[PDB]
């Protein structure tokens, strides 16, 4: 599923991401835009053989099991394929664990390079929330 901007903002709000660990909703929408272009089916392979999955590009090196990342962890206790669903619940619940692990949203390279320090409120402007 390819979300619209305000559609995704509302879904992320319903799932408790607005101001989660202090990160306002626009941060999460901005991260999703630049990680996946709002596409739940996005995948990208990393140099070390791990793979990033879904709307927030969660990495199989630490967070999910895909059966092809030897020596990796599965800290969200899910198959990586569950992060590609049109229902974003699994991606949101895993992202909550990630952002709580001490480094905040710096875990998302695209957030750090394209959202951090910008006017992220613009990503939810005009949306009925
Ligand atoms: Cl957009
Ligand atoms: Cl915001
Ligand atoms: Cl594995
Ligand atoms: Cl949902
Ligand atoms: Cl933080
Ligand atoms: Na893994």
Inside any domain, residue 129: no
Q: Rounded to the nearest whole angstrom, what is the distance from the C-alpha of residue 55 to the centroid of ligand 5?
A: 21
Distance CA 28, CA 16 (A): 11
Query: Nearest bound ligand to CA 71?
Result: 3
Domain extent for 46: 5-124
- Dihedral angle over CA of 43, 89, 121, 103, nearest 10: -70
Technique of determination: X-ray
7 is catalytic: no
Q: What is the CATH number of the domain that holds 33?
A: 1.10.530.10
- Describe the chain by its helix, strand, coil percentages, rounded to 5: 40, 10, 50
Inside any domain, residue 40: yes
35 is catalytic: yes
The number of domains in the chain is 1
> Which of helix, strand or coil describes residue 90?
helix
Inside any domain, residue 82: yes
Resolution in units of Å: 1.6
């Amino acid at each position: 599923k390819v979300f619209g901007r305000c559609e995704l903002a509302a879904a992320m709000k319903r799932h408790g991401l607005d101001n989660y660990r202090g990160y306002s909703l626009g941060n999460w929408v901005c991260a999703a835009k630049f990680e996946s272009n709002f596409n739940t089916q996005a995948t990208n392979r990393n140099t070390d053989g791990s793979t990033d999955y879904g709307i927030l590009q969660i990495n199989s090196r630490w967070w999910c099991n895909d059966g092809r990342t030897p020596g990796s962890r599965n800290l969200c206790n899910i198959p990586c394929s569950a992060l590609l669903s049109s229902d974003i619940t699994a991606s949101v619940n895993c992202a909550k664990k990630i952002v709580s692990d001490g480094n905040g949203m710096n875990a998302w390279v695209a957030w750090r390079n394209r959202c951090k320090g910008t006017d992220v409120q613009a990503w939810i402007r005009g949306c009925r929330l």
